[PDB]
């Protein structure tokens, strides 16, 4: 938890650094969740979707 | 002129150590009126819950007789020599001093020794002083400010004996015997930890001679290793409120962390208290006052009075505000207090730090006048530093303060801290603790 | 100059840094003396019922 | 008021301010970091 | 006015000085209630005119030299009675479980060996306690009252000194139904001291008390400023404390006995306030 | 002193929302009024989108709704949101009425 302490001291003191942190984290979280959503949605079916019979056709 | 040379012309406190671990200190000045005192590091912080109120009761029976001159011969001789005796005891320190003349000095030191070490204890005395001190507690359940400080310490240092008061709870006081007081005298009043300090027209070697007569040959010998040491006190940070709706005024105190004694953070927070500090409603020129908190509190009539203040203790302390106000203006008083705090934190400008430096110089110099406050500062400094640092170095440490270090310390000790909030009286319109914590920083 | 040695259900606290052996109460020394008195009486009666050459068998521990 | 002190909150506190000898200085940072990390993660979720 | 008169003793002082003078020493330090808002700037201007003259100004400097302050005072200062004794009483029902009775006659002017004798007299009768939470092992008034009434009380002497006149007496903070025994015990104690029962070591102890109190009065440099300024404006010039203390402890005992005789035999004035259901008025005193 | 206490909008907002004296012993049953307000603004927003894509003509109404559900991007989620938000509006409505009769706030 010592790593969490310097995390507080770097990214939760003021408003500008906090706001830049939550904006950059929101964009990276967008990126990661959209990749995870694509992976799970095209991983659960594997025999129905448009992808496999859009490259085989 | 030659004010820097005037700070160079400040007399120096000759400090030495007598062989029993005694810490002696002297200011040899040109005043025939003198003041001689003994400072003791034994407060209520070393007391337990079944030992609470020990040192207070010892102070009340330190003057009421001894094995040498019992009952009333002490008072008769001192009032026959015109000296004024005074004593106080705190949670951390206890002082006994005599304000006298240069030709009453050796009898004063000898009777001071007789007061300190030779305390005989009868039982009519413990009965009588028990009754009168319980009357004292009954009467001082009315003086509001000390009750506020007791509530604040009790909610601030929960578990450690720093939360205890000096007098302690009345129930432990009304049930003790001679034995626990005897244990207090045998354990705490010890020659290695006591300081003899004096000021006035008297030589350092003369006071050395008087100590070599009287204070050479004291106890100087502990019990079976049963010795106190400063445990690091656990400041919780919380709030207590005593709602009682029969009072005309309301008393609200708030406090945050302390610097202790060693760091120059204490100097910077004294600069902060010189910025705000005290205001009472018996002043003049209120609509044009320098402190903007006082400006708003006059222009809109917020409170009756306030003071923002420092209290320090061994490696710790409390720092904050105490105000007396009507119940209809608690919220705006607290709102403008948070506004002034955050204006000092985020916007430490030029002229306010200039005025704080000048006000703290003025406060220190006005504190150093009279033999008793100077010798008292000597005794408590040697129980908090081991040295009386002279005023030129004080001026140097003041001159090493800029607004940048000010807002560094203000970010360190004000910016979203966990406070201690004590409310007393008609405190219906006290703002809620989570709202106060949300108001501890404004993001804009 | 250390993380001050956290104790745990395996982390046995050694008798050097207690730190309760710093602000010792006089009644705690009295408790230590009473503990010495208990061990003194028990080992005294052990050596009574133990060194007897007239005795033959076991020590007959009531506590076990 | 001399008879007035607190009841214990040992049932409620976090283990860092549990012992009566440990200071509240170092226990501030990780506590503030945990709570404000929860708030910032909630903020990122609501914003997305 | 509210802040000042939150204490009863301010009312005691003001109604006492209203009770001893028909004249200018019976003025108040504070404004009355009906005069609030009923003042003129015209009286203020006339007061500034004929009171702030160049003849009534004392400029003292502690920390600055003579000629600089002297030159500033030259450059910027070019701008240019006998209160009789009333006699009697003032009684005010206040009812706060604190009976306050101040018993005061007229003593002497300011700056005299007779004023030193009245100061020695009040140090004989009893002053403020030398020991905090002490038990006052010298004041025979304290001992006679504690012999009499076993209640928490307050018996204190009092000496106001002024240019034209001056007041001496004592003052009691006592119980509701236990005031008269305290006051009459103090009265007969002062009578039996005035008979000629004066102790020479008590005289020397009172000399110690007066010397110590006057030397401790100039501990603060603002207090020393006050002493120097009031002495240089009252008696014309400052005098160092050596010969002043010499004339303090060079007074006689017959001065003290005759001063107590003047006090008791003189006609008394008094200020009584509180729940006064058991207060001896005049003829009982 | 305070912008919130001198500006006339923030006076009403302060005495209705921030410094409103409310009791303290409240379970989830008093959330329903705020939920009715949120459903109010949400249903107004969905109806606003629908009125930006709907025609009230009996020849073309059904085909216009089909155009919303199929041709218009996310018009199907907005139609379903308006309908099921009306349904949950009635749910919160009857829960609020049942609360007002059950705890006995009907004296007002
Ligand atoms: C039209 C939809 C309604 C809206 C938007 C609405 C709005 C509100 C709001 C915001 C509150 C305060 C917060 C709360 O207690 O939940 C409230 C309370 C209340 N409403 Fe309504 N309300 C509605 C319908 C009704 C109806 C139909 C009644 C019954 C006649 C009613 C009676 C009450 C009562 C008695 C309270 C106070 C409940 C208490 O103090 O415990 N409301 N309403
Ligand atoms: C003024 C704002 C509103 C507008 C402009 C509006 C507009 C519309 C339109 C155009 C329709 C027909 C399209 C459709 O059925 O999806 C509709 C249907 C409907 N609206 Fe609204 N509406 C509004 C407010 C409300 C409110 C406050 C409610 C009640 C919570 C509500 C409940 C319904 C229901 C139940 C339907 C039928 C849903 C269906 O059968 O598919 N509307 N609204």
State the virtual CA torsion across E177, E179, E185, E186 in degrees, nearest 10. 170
Other CB atoms within 10 A of residue B28 CB: 19
Q: How far is CA B303 from the centre of its chain?
A: 25
Query: Cα dist. D45→A22, D41, E229 in Å?
Result: 10, 6, 76
Secondary structure of residue D20 in the 3-state scheme: coil
Angle between helices B403-413 and B330-346 (to 10 degrees): 130
CA atoms within 13 A on the CB side of C21: 7
Give the residue from F60, F59, F81, F63 showing the smallest Cα distance to F71. F63
Yes or no: say if B409 and B268 are a contact pair by the CB < 8 Å rule. Answer: yes
Angle between helices E140-148 and E180-194 (to 10 degrees): 140
Q: Six-digit token pair at E62?
A: 């502690």
B67 close contact with A: CB closer than 8 A: no
Yes or no: say if B166 and B90 are a contact pair by the CB < 8 Å rule. Answer: yes
CA distance B128 to B132: 6
Residue appearing with tokens 């927003």:
F45
Encode burial over B54-64: b for 16+ CB neighbours within 10 A, e otherwise. bbbbbbbbbbb
* Start-end of H helices in C1-64: 26-48
Q: Do B234 and D20 touch (CB under 8 A)?
A: yes
B141 interaction partners in chain D (CB closer than 8 Å): 1-2
Strand partners, B34: B100
Yes or no: say if B56 and B167 are a contact pair by the CB < 8 Å rule. Answer: yes
Q: Do C26 and B226 touch (CB under 8 A)?
A: yes
Element housing E72 (H / E) = helix E66-75
Name the E strands within E55-165.
88-93, 99-106, 154-161
- The residue whose CA is least distant from atom 41 of ligand 1 is F105
What is the distance in A from the centroid of ligand 1 to the CA of F105?
Answer: 9
The residue annotated as part of the active site, out of B12, B27, B47, B59, is B59
Yes or no: say if B301 and B329 are a contact pair by the CB < 8 Å rule. Answer: yes
Give the residue from E96, E97, E95, E102 showing the smallest Cα distance to E152. E97
Q: Do B228 and C25 touch (CB under 8 A)?
A: no
Q: Which residue of B has its CA nearest to A14?
A: B443
Q: Which residue of D has its CA nearest to A27?
A: D48
Yes or no: say if E99 and E41 are a contact pair by the CB < 8 Å rule. Answer: no
Give B45→chain C minimum CA distance, Å.
12
With touching defined as 3 or more inter-chain CB pairs under 8 Å, the answer for chains B and F is: yes
- Residue of E63, E126, E130, E211 to mutate for B, most B C-beta atoms under 10 A: E130
CA dihedral over E109, E111, E115, E117, signed as positive or negative? negative
Yes or no: say if B363 and B394 are a contact pair by the CB < 8 Å rule. Answer: no
B94, burial (CB in 10 Å: exposed 0-12, middle 13-18, buried 19+):
buried
**Residue B95 CB partners (closer than 8 Å, separation 6+):** B37, B38, B39, B40, B87, B88, B89, B376, B379, B380
Q: Six-digit token pair at D13?
A: 């506190």
Technique that determined the structure:
cryo-EM
Q: Which residue of B has its CA nearest to C33?
A: B224
State the virtual CA torsion across F65, F66, F68, F71 in degrees, nearest 10. -160
Question: Residue F98: CB within 6 Å of ligand 1?
Answer: no
Resolution in A: 4.6
CA distance B391 to E243: 36
Q: Six-digit token pair at B41?
A: 């590091």
CA dihedral over B199, B200, B206, B212, signed as positive or negative? negative
Q: Binding site: which residues of F?
A: 82, 96
Q: Binding site for heme b: which residues of F?
A: 82, 96
Q: Please give the DSSP secondary-structure letter assigned to residue B215.
A: T
Whole-angstrom distance between the N-terminal and C-terminal Cα of chain A? 54
Yes or no: say if E134 and E125 are a contact pair by the CB < 8 Å rule. Answer: no
- Residue of A9, A15, A18, A20 to mutate for B, most B C-beta atoms under 10 A: A15
Question: Residue F6: CB within 6 Å of ligand 1?
Answer: no
Secondary structure of residue A43 in the 3-state scheme: helix
């Amino acid at each position: 938890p010592t790593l969490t302490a310097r995390l507080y001291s770097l990214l939760f003191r003021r408003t500008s650094t906090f706001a830049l942190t939550i904006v950059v984290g929101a964009l990276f979280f967008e990126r990661a969740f959209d990749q995870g959503a694509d992976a799970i949605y095209e991983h659960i079916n594997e025999g129905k979707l448009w992808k496999h019979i859009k490259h085989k056709y | 002129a030659t004010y820097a040379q005037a700070l160079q012309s400040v007399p120096e406190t000759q400090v030495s150590q007598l062989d029993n671990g005694l810490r002696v200190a002297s200011e040899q000045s040109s005043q025939p009126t003198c003041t001689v005192g003994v400072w003791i590091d034994a407060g209520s912080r070393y007391e337990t819950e079944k030992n609470n109120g020990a040192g207070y009761f010892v102070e009340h029976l330190a003057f009421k007789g001894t094995k040498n001159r019992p009952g009333n011969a002490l008072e008769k001789e001192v009032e026959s020599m015109g000296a004024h005796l005074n004593a106080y005891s705190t949670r951390e320190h206890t002082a006994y001093y005599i304000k006298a003349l240069s030709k009453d000095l050796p009898k004063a030191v000898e009777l001071l020794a007789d007061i300190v070490q030779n305390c005989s204890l009868e039982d009519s005395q413990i009965e009588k002083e028990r009754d009168v001190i319980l009357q004292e507690l009954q009467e001082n359940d009315t003086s509001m400010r000390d009750v506020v400080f007791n509530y604040l310490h009790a909610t601030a240092f929960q578990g450690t004996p720093l939360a205890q008061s000096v007098e302690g709870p009345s129930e432990n006081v009304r049930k003790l015997s001679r034995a626990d007081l005897t244990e207090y005298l045998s354990r705490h009043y010890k020659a290695p930890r006591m300081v003899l300090a004096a000021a006035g027209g008297l030589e350092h070697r003369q006071l050395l001679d008087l100590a070599q007569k009287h204070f050479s040959g004291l106890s100087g010998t502990y019990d079976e290793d049963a010795v106190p040491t400063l445990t690091p006190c656990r400041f919780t940070g919380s709030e207590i409120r005593h709602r009682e709706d029969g009072l005309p005024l309301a008393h609200v105190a708030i406090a945050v962390e302390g610097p202790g004694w060693a760091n120059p953070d204490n100097v910077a927070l004294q600069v902060a208290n010189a910025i705000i500090g005290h205001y009472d409603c018996t002043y003049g020129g209120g609509m044009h006052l320098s402190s903007p908190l006082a400006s708003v509190a006059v222009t809109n009539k917020l409170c009756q009075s306030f003071q923002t203040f420092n209290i320090c203790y061994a490696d710790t302390g409390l720092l904050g505000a105490h105000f007396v106000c009507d119940h209809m203006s608690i919220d705006d008083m607290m709102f403008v207090l948070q506004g002034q705090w955050m204006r000092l934190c985020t916007s430490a400008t030029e002229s306010e730090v200039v005025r704080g430096k000048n006000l703290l110089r003025n406060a220190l110099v006005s504190h150093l006048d009279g033999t008793t406050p100077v010798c008292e500062d000597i005794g408590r400094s040697l129980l908090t530093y081991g040295r009386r640092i002279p005023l030129a170095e004080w001026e140097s440490r003041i001159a090493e303060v800029d607004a940048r270090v000010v807002r560094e310390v203000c970010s360190k000790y004000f910016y979203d801290q966990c406070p201690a909030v004590a409310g007393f009286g008609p405190i219906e319109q006290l703002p809620d603790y989570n709202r106060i914590r949300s108001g501890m920083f404004w993001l804009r | 100059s250390f993380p001050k040695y956290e104790p745990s259900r395996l982390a046995s606290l050694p008798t050097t840094l207690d730190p309760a052996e710093y602000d010792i109460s006089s009644e705690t020394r009295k408790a230590q003396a009473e503990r010495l008195a208990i061990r003194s009486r028990l080992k005294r009666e052990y050596q009574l019922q133990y060194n007897d050459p007239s005795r033959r068998g076991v020590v007959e521990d009531p506590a076990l | 008021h001399t008879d007035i002190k607190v009841p214990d909150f040992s049932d409620y506190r976090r283990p860092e301010v549990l012992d009566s000898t440990k200071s509240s200085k170092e226990s501030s940072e990780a506590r503030k970091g945990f709570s404000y990390l929860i708030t910032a993660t909630t903020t990122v979720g609501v914003a997305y | 006015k509210a802040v000042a008169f939150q204490n009863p003793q301010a009312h005691v002082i003001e109604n006492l000085h209203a009770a001893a003078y028909r004249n200018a020493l019976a003025n108040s330090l504070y404004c009355p209630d009906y005069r609030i808002g009923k003042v003129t700037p015209d009286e203020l201007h006339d007061y500034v005119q004929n009171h702030f003259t160049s003849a009534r100004m004392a400029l003292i400097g502690l920390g600055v030299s003579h000629p600089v302050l002297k030159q500033v005072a030259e450059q910027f200062l070019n701008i240019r009675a006998k209160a009789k004794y009333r006699g009697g009483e003032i009684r005010e029902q206040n009812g706060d479980s604190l009976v306050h009775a101040a018993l005061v006659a007229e003593s002497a002017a300011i700056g005299s060996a007779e004023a030193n004798a009245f100061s020695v007299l009040q140090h004989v009768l009893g002053a403020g306690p030398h020991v905090k939470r002490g038990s006052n092992a010298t004041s025979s008034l304290y001992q006679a009252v504690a012999k009499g009434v076993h209640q928490p009380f307050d018996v204190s002497a009092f000496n106001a000194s002024y240019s034209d006149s001056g007041l001496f007496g004592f003052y009691t903070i006592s119980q509701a139904a236990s005031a008269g025994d305290v006051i009459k015990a103090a009265y007969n104690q002062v009578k039996t001291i005035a008979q000629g029962n004066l102790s020479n070591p008590d005289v020397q102890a009172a000399k110690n008390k007066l010397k110590a109190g006057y030397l401790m009065s100039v501990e603060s440099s603002e207090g020393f400023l006050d002493e120097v300024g009031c002495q240089a404006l009252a008696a014309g010039s400052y005098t160092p404390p050596s010969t002043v203390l010499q004339q303090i402890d060079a007074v006689a005992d017959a001065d003290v006995i005759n001063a107590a005789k003047k006090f008791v035999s003189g006609r008394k004035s008094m200020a009584a306030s509180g729940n006064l259901g058991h207060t001896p008025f005049i003829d009982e005193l | 002193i305070n912008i919130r206490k001198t500006h006339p909008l923030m006076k009403i907002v302060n005495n209705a929302f921030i410094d409103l004296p409310a009791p303290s012993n409240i379970s989830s049953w008093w959330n329903f009024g705020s939920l009715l307000g949120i459903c109010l603004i949400l249903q107004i927003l969905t109806g606003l989108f629908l009125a930006m894509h709907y025609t009230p003509d009996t020849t073309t109404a059904f085909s216009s709704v089909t155009h919303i559900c199929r041709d218009v991007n996310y018009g199907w989620i907005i139609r379903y949101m308006h309908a099921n938000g009306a349904s949950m509006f009635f749910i919160c409505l009857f829960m609020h009425v049942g609360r007002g009769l059950y705890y006995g706030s009907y004296t007002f």
